[PDB]
């Protein structure tokens, strides 16, 4: 999808 | 008075130009202060030499990672992580500066610069600043991204500090 994470990047 | 900071951006080592940000210390002083201090490098570490490793055209540019002892992802000036200070400010449009995280209360050093309104992230990412000048630079960076975030040239913060 459109997330801004730090390590487990998701869709 | 809200502090201003600057990044001098390079593309494959070649300086493109400067971007400056107003940090909203009047609203999230702790989050603003972390970013300011990592920009000046005054604690002995920070954004200088760091890179924008994930750029999604239409969405945002994310950077602020650097290697440190005792874990990964970046560290803040207060420790390995710190609390979501508040969610007063929303992701209102292009230029917004907001903290990347790995869930609640996991702020460190990573952040992103929005290239669009990203309302779906309100309440989950602490907004804390906004591009002041050099959005043309951020728009130029954005072209080097892709749907999956991989950049076709290496986008770095050649230098940074406070104005």
CATH of the domain at B99: 2.40.100.10
Cited resolution, angstroms = 2.7
d(CA B141, CA B135): 10
Examine the residue annotation and report whether B101 is marked as an active-site residue of this protein.
yes
Mutation for testing the B interface, residue in A2, A3, A5, A6 having most B CBs under 10 Å:
A6
User: Which residues are B21's β-sheet partners?
Assistant: B5, B131
* DSSP characters over B109-142: S-EEEESS--GGGTTTS-EEEEEEE-HHHHHHHH
Q: Where in the sequence is the domain holding B131, given as residue range(s)?
A: 1-163
How many residues are there in chain A? 11
For the four alpha carbons of B30, B123, B74 and B138, in that order, the dihedral sign comes to negative
Contact B110, B47 (CB under 8 A): no
Q: Do B60 and A7 touch (CB under 8 A)?
A: no
| Mutate: best of B67, B91, B110, partner A, most A CBs <10 A | B110
Q: Cα–Cα distance between B98 and B107 in angstroms, integer?
A: 10
Experimental method: X-ray
Q: Is the Cβ pair A7, B100 closer than 8 Å? A: no
One DSSP character per residue, B61-100 reads: EEE----BTTBSS--BTTBS-B------S---STTEEEE-
Tokens 């502090």, residue located: B3
Number of domains in chain B: 1
Q: Does B53 participate in catalysis according to the annotation? A: no
Q: Which residues of B10-26 are buried (b: 16+ CB within 10 A; e: fewer)?
A: bbeeeebebbbbbbbbe
């Amino acid at each position: 999808x459109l997330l801004v994470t730090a390590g487990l990047v998701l869709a | 008075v809200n502090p201003t900071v600057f990044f001098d951006i390079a593309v494959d080592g070649e300086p493109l130009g400067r971007v400056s940000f107003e940090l909203f210390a009047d609203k999230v002083p702790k989050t603003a202060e972390n970013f300011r201090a990592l920009s000046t490098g005054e604690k002995g570490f920070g954004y200088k030499g760091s890179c924008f490793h994930r750029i999604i055209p239409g969405f945002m540019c994310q950077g602020g990672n650097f290697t440190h002892h005792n874990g990964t992802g970046g560290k803040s000036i207060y420790g390995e992580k710190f609390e979501d200070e508040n969610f007063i400010l929303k992701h209102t449009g292009p230029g917004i500066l907001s903290m990347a995280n790995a869930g609640p209360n996991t702020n460190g050093s990573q952040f992103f610069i929005c290239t669009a309104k990203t309302e779906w992230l309100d309440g989950k990412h602490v907004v804390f600043g906004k591009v002041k000048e050099g959005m043309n630079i951020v728009e130029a960076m954005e072209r080097f991204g892709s749907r999956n975030g991989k950049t076709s040239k290496k986008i770095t913060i050649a230098d940074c500090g406070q104005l």
